[model samples]
Target: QNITEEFYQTTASAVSKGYLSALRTGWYTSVITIELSNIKENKCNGTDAKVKLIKQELDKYKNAVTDLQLLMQSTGSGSAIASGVAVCKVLHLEGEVNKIKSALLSTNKAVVSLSNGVSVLTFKVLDLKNYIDKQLLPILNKQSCSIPNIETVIEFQQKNNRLLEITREFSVNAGVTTPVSTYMLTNSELLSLINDMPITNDQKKLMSNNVQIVRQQSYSIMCIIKEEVLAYVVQLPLYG
Candidate 1:
């Protein structure tokens, strides 16, 4: 019976992770679209097939995002740690997206190749669950932190939901909707909340360390993307 229970548990965990992966992939599809749109605007001609190719890919994945999200919602394990780690990935991807927007706005040559780098990064994001498992969940399990309370976690979710809501509000108020603007605004708000939230010294250290590790992971993913995809993108005629 014990063996059978263990098998069931493991299977459930795997299924849950699969749901998370699907949701993340959907988000990355949108991320790719955003980066590709920026690249088309700054470098490629308006009629470039590469841009159209990417849009079709975006369309292909668009419904999958919503479908995966609903599936995850229906069947998630409600693990707080799992949810928080997923939030970090969302944050990481948003940061990268914002960085791409900045680079394009600045007319940076670096961005032309780097735009393809976004797609590269999307592939790397698949490893998010593994990274969180190795780097974060273990530490959080080992360390007893008072700062990351149930209330704190709930507040965090509330803030996240609010941010998403505000994005829709932008369309209502301004007759426009921009993910870049919405992301930047919400990110700063979340950062301010984190900075101000009360925490014990040890909790602060643990949280800080977790953030550093995730940031490094983000950096490492970008480097891989640049080395692999960016190099190839530069050789392409469209990039030139």
Candidate 2:
């Protein structure tokens, strides 16, 4: 059911945030484990197998970031500058992850190609372990991690807010109540919200204030994990 899909998507927004939170924590754990693992303790049996494994996980991480970018595209509203801000924030993180991921991969290749019976491939995996530990782990430790600024979440609901204001004003102006839902809004009503201009500075403030405020949302969290903020900034509905 799309309703269920909606529920899941909404819930996922939070779960994804938690997953990132977990990632930061886990990255930290990986760092500590690598330091304590005593790489010399294990008799290196083979190199190719471990190199392949490193590449596989790198592929997984790369695809995950691509998926996030796709979602940002899906949510982005070209007509709205405010909505665009959200997409920007997420995209920022995507770029950062890409940068780090590329660096790791470059090092991975270097390790894989250098060995003749030297188990370079095995060393590649070991290098990634160390790289992720040092680079990715520290990202989670920063205080600024999280997605969708506090205001973006509120602005998402702000459509409802605008709808209500429109309904009230419309009824007074046209003597009919406008119907709107959490899931949707009609074109005419949407237009009404879009076209209504503020008569006072206070009204203008309401119209623009927190129009795209970033906060402790999942999108915010994603940005935090990846270390780039503007990539995920989404555009808001700006016409009204």
Candidate 3:
């Protein structure tokens, strides 16, 4: 209705969209590394299965980032435009963030699952699913039709499983692993890979680069909304 309401809505929508998109994309990028040198005696180290799960999640996150980029490009407001650039500036960085978070969570679980003869990768797969369940499912429960393609994606799980089979093998061949060897790439390895990417002049010049300005603007908007909400609360005193 007013800029104050609009501001709250903007933030709420951003959080909602961010959560839903993360779910619909069906992933949490992470890596597991095996020091092949140490495991030279074992031909089938379960690390490969965990790597398979990471590759699946990585591809999913990549697609989510791509979709977010397209959505931002299609929408334009002065603030939204600035936010778009900010999101764009950190697009690859976000993929890295999810990778790190997933890697840490999955690796610990993998270590435990390894002793059980339960595929360590199974834990990674469920870990990613649990993140979606914990982080996104609540939002979906709050807002109907939030994810858009939920039914379809669920139906196609078998297809994704097959894709996982092929791609996981490919990822191992391409040198993805947990731990470090200077030979295989881990979550930290992918993170370091992003660090080496050159930032462009446009990204450096993004208008919302000032964290202070953004913080002030956000708080100012919140204060205005608080005033209006309190005004309504004040009116309630008259009825009492």
Each candidate's TM vs. the true structure? 0.19, 0.21, 0.18
Model 2 TM-score, 2 decimals: 0.21
Give per-model CA RMSD: 23.6, 23.0, 23.1
Please list the C-alpha lDDT of all candidates, in the order they appear.
0.27, 0.28, 0.27
lDDT, candidate 3, 1-240, per-residue tens: 443432313332322323322333111121232110000111222233433443344355434333323432342245422322332233223243243234444353222122212211211222233434443343334422233244434433443342244234324433111222212222343333223223344422321232222122210000001100100000000000
**Candidate 2 per-residue lDDT over residues 1-240, each given as its tens digit:** 444432213321322434433333110000000001111111222234433343344344444344443443443354223222432343343343343344444442221211112211110122223444453333223343222234433433432233233224322433111122211222332223323432345634532332221112111111222332112111112212
List the candidate 1 regions with Cα displacement exceeding 4 Å: 1-148, 166-240
The number of the candidate with the highest TM-score is 2
lDDT of 1 by residue, 14-111 (tens): 22323322333112111221111101112223244433443343333333233323332332246322322233344334245455444434332221
Q: Which parts of model 3 are misplaced by more than 4 Å?
A: 1-126, 146-240
Q: Candidate 3 lDDT (Cα, whole model)?
A: 0.27
lDDT of 1: 0.27
